[PDB]
Amino acid sequence: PLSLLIGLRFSRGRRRGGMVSLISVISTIGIALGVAVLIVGLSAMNGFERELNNRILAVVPHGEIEAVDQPWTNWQEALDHVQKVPGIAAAAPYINFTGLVESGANLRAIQVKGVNPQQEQRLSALPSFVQGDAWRNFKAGEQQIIIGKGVADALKVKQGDWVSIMIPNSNPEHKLMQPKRVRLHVAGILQLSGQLDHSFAMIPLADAQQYLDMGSSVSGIALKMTDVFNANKLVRDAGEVTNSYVYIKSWIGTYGYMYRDIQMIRAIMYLAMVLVIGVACFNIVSTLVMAVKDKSGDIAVLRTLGAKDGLIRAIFVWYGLLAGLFGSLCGVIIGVVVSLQLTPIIEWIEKLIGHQFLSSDIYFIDFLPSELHWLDVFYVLVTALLLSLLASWYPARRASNIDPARVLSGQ
Amino acid sequence: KILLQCDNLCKRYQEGSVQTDVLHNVSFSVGEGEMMAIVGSSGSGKSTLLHLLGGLDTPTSGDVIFNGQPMSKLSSAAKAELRNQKLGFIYQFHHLLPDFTALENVAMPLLIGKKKPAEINSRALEMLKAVGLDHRANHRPSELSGGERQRVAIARALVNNPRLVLADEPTGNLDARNADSIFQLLGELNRLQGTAFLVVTHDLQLAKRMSRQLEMRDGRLTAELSM
Amino acid sequence: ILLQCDNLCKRYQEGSVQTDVLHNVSFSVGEGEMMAIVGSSGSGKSTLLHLLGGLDTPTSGDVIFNGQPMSKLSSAAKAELRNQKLGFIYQFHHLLPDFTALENVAMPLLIGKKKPAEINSRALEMLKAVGLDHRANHRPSELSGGERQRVAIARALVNNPRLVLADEPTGNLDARNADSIFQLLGELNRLQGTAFLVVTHDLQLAKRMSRQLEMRDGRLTAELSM
Amino acid sequence: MYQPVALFIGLRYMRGRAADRFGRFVSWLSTIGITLGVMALVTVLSVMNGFERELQNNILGLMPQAILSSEHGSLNPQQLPETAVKLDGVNRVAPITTGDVVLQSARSVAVGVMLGIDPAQKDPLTPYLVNVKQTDLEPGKYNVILGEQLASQLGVNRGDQIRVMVPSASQFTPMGRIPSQRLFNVIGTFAANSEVDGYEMLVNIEDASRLMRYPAGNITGWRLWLDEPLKVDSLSQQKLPEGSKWQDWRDRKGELFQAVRMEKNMMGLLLSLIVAVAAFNIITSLGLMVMEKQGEVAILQTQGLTPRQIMMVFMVQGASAGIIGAILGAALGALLASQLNNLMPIIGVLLDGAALPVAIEPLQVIVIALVAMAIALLSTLYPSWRAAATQPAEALRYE
Ligand SMILES: [Mg+2]
Ligand SMILES: [Mg+2]
Is residue D348 one of the residues assigned to a domain? Predict the structure, then answer.
């Protein structure tokens, strides 16, 4: 094929020996670098959302349907049949009250929680890996209670002992009924990031039998928004499935000024990624257009020799296709390698110390890479190949259009 | 009996500084199988004229008719059609593809016509031997000396047997050897093949080989050669 | 003595074949002496004259100027030389494209930092000498084929060099500028003690230099026997 | 014209032939790239600085940030005078008795923390108080101020007094460590726009001391305002001369600290990507330009110009291009940074971040421009020397 031969010869060096010109190799390297940086940035960005609703948002409840009239309003039959709407698929009930731990140690105040055994795993992500495996199977009878690294740490014992919290101030009504349920041992302990281990305690559901709470009707909970961001204020025109008495409590926006940080960070992320894309595209386009303009002289000779538009188009199409293909292959390989094996690159300059990028980051990840390939690398490769072909094509058409003798003399 | 046709072919270059006129109402004709020679002083406007004759510079207030059809008339595809089988243009300060050796450069009109591998090679070498630099068929223009590249350009022009051959000082960078020999070559071409020639040259000893040597006179081509 | 060649040989080989050019070149150009070189295309005239200057490294020879070889000169020393003693002209003459004819002619002087006024006056001096004052405002692109050659000649001779090397100074021009520029060089030599060594193909006026040599694929034959 | 040859040649090359549209905007691609890189870097840095300032002030500013004390309490002279209390940052000294407490209420039992401030001195929360005499606040039988998120909503509301408990107290050992408790009176309700409301309350000075252990007149420590609470790790790692334990806000809002640390780290990674790509473009474009003009270099060298002067010829052009690019990029980046609040028609509906910008001209902006200058100078320096060594005849042949 004539076009391929001419393109290859144009992409050849100025001197015998090396079969690669400086400009072609340079454009290849630029395209590869752009593709690699785009891949890395997109992978980190996607990992951001992958981790956000996995270790910092799942633990916090996504909503609440608490009302001032539980019986038959928020507690019709077993519960409000909020499962009808397809937004969520695990409602479960929810009972909350406060108490104190009595162990002859640093007393702490805990807002305890009620959780149903063989349940609460479809609801939130608080159930986490811990030595106390099969703990839920041991949760029953309203006797044993599970705490975090809170009052357990404050007290000088762990699961190895059986010290009871002895809630002394369980007063649902202001009058001091104070039913002191004592000898509630703990056999499992959980750990969470940072704080709020000080105010977590697991009580089997339907604990009202002995805690003097009224009946089996509790506050309840719902609205486990899977697409929390897209579900933001999505309860508008919805949520009537609950048929509660008073306006339900809000979604995770109730603990505001952290969701604000989340949204602001996401905005800055989008801005930075847009800047990356623009810079890389500009670099690639500038290099390709400069090279093609540098190769404008021979186009006039070909046109005056009788070359048609098709051959001129095909020559630079092949040139750009070759450059883009090789650069995209190299960039894809390097970027995939980096993204898949970036976090495992822990600098051993200081033995498990410092690294200048890891400090006080436990239960989170120093970096956050996630390679959602076969749907994102394809876009980058297609965009690179396009940009390359368009940059190759545009100046070639202009040079061919110009009177051949005119450009041979002027440029 | 007509190949070239000029009707007041005027031109002027002006980028916004001054009006630098070149030509004033050029008009002549080159008969089928007719030779002509152009003479004049530097700066007259010969090269610009011959560029206008082809479809390689837009005339200002004139037109050129080839085989009863103007040049701006031809579409881009039609002009590409024409340049392969009817144009034998040679370039002053001749420009060659630098990454292609002499053989490929000579063969390019045929490759563009897609003649044949074997025919193309044989005929490129045909014309190269005609010009007479067989021992530089493997040298790129960079490695070629000053004159052999000019002969390569001539061979490329005449490889495809064009009907008309426009030239810009085909033999001005060469000794008498290649000047005289290449005039012999063109002379046989015309009387063996019905090809016309129109060559601009400064060597007045052989300028009259074309006969009817015109004189470019800073606009209009004076019939005589009275300086 | 101005030029001195001792078996100035050369050869180009990129790894394909040994393409010899010259075989034991040796001659001299006397102070204020003209010479002309003749031969067939491909002989190696341009390569020879490039070797004469410090613009191509000889393989197995040397060139001595004013009793000091060219490779002897340091880079600064060669830059020193090229401003006041070299009047080299280029085949397929190359000019700065973004600089008009006047500035191109004035560049040797600007590099010498003569004066604003002197530089302008003398650039125009030499431009009028060659006779293209009408195209003193045109860049090389806008200039035609011959006026750029005359601009190159003027740039070569603007600074009054001791020796003037040329590569077909008048081969792209009609008899007008050929004869007139030979007249110009002729006055230059006998008004000013400047020697000339010009390669040309026009044999009518090649003998103006006198002692016309004949480059013959290595060694410059003293006779013009073809 | 100009006496210096290098300056004239560089300027003329920078101007270019300008065939149709300034070389179809191909001649100034170097300046265009410098501008784009500088603009992007400036915008990113300004927005990150604004984010850090927002986190420092609008959230962590109101709440306590650091406390020092001794084992279970201080001594009569506050365990120390003001001397040897200032270590780093802008530290303001103010006694405090922070301690978690249980605010039992008739409507609903709730828990929260408090601050033992004195009426004499101001605090972040003093201007927010409404319908109350903060300045004239005597103990008044343990008077307190709190509300607008706890008393007003899910509380005993203003007035009617409220319960306050301190679990950390050993009053009567025989039973289950009965804490120290007493009824407190409400005289106001602070209105706050941060998390302070609903989790924090104000108490008179010395009332927490009387209620809690250790002698009256002492405190639980001293507030220490920090100039860089974002990077409070360095302060915590350092041990103050007195040996007092360093308490910090990270003990409560650890999730936010970890999240901001990770976000800053990965944003630095993105900035590194930006810098690498931009610098690659600079080197590539300027080097290819210098290599492209080798024929002109050869023509120039044969007529008196030394290898050391052509280097200046190219460095002049490089410096001019870098200057134009850096100035344009700085201007455009400053404008874009101080134009990000608006231009959010539909994205702002769900993403109300506003991209809080902070254009810190003094240092961050200038350093980027200087780095670009140096990079351009070196990139024009090396290839110029490489091309100045080739023999002119060899260069003019391939040309
Ligand atoms: Mg001409
Ligand atoms: Mg030559």
Answer: no
Distance between CA atoms of residues D66 and C9, nearest Å: 86
Residues A329, A274: Cα–Cα separation, whole Å: 23
* C16/A409 touch (CB, cutoff 8 Å), yes or no: no
Q: Which ligand is nearest to the CA of B91?
A: 1
CA gap C146, C153 in Å, rounded = 11
CA A272 from centroid of its chain's CA atoms: 16
SS3 B53: helix
**Torsion D283-D285-D288-D293 (CA) sign:** negative
* Residue A247 per-residue DSSP state: P
Measured on CA atoms in the order A108, A111, A116, A122, is the torsion positive or negative?
Answer: negative
Q: Any idea which ligand is nearest the CA of B172?
A: 1
Residues of C with Cβ-Cβ distance to A15 under 8 angstroms = 14
Segment (H or E) for D374:
helix D366-388
Residue B48 and residue B51: Cα distance in Å, rounded?
Answer: 5
The dihedral through the CA atoms of C104, C109, C112, C116 has a sign that is negative
Q: What are phi and psi of D254, to 5 degrees?
A: -75, -35
Q: Which helix (H) or strand (E) holds A116?
A: none
Domain containing residue D194: 63-250
* CA–CA gap between residue A174 and residue B1 (Å, rounded): 122
In whole angstroms, what is the distance from residue D150 CA to residue A239 CA?
Answer: 26
Q: Is the dihedral of CA C152, C153, C158, C163 positive or negative?
A: positive
Rounded Cα distance, C36 and B225, in Å: 30
Structure tokens at A112: 């305890």
| Overall domain count for chain D | 2
Please report, for chain A, the start and end positions of each structural domain, with discontinuous segments joined by +: 2-54+260-347+355-410
Resolution of this model in Å is 3.5
CB C109 within 8 A of CB C122: yes
Which tokens sit at B160?
Answer: 């495809």
Angstroms from A409 CA to nearest CA on chain C? 6
Residues found in chain A: 411
Neighbours of chain A (3+ CB pairs under 8 A): B, C, D
Expressed in angstroms and rounded, the spacing between residue D302 Cα and the centre of ligand 2 is 17
C223 in contact with A, Cβ within 8 Å:
no
- The count of other CB atoms within 10 Å of the CB of residue C18 is 7
Q: How far is CA B46 from CA C40, C172, C191, in A?
A: 28, 13, 36
Secondary structure (DSSP) of D184-209:
EEE------SSTTTTTEEEE-TTHHH
The technique is cryo-EM
DSSP structure class, residue D365: I
Residue numbers in A near B77 (CB within 8 A):
308-309
Residue of A nearest to B104 (CA): A6
Question: Which amino acid, one-letter code, is at D30?
Answer: S
Query: Tokens at residue C225, please?
Result: 């026997």
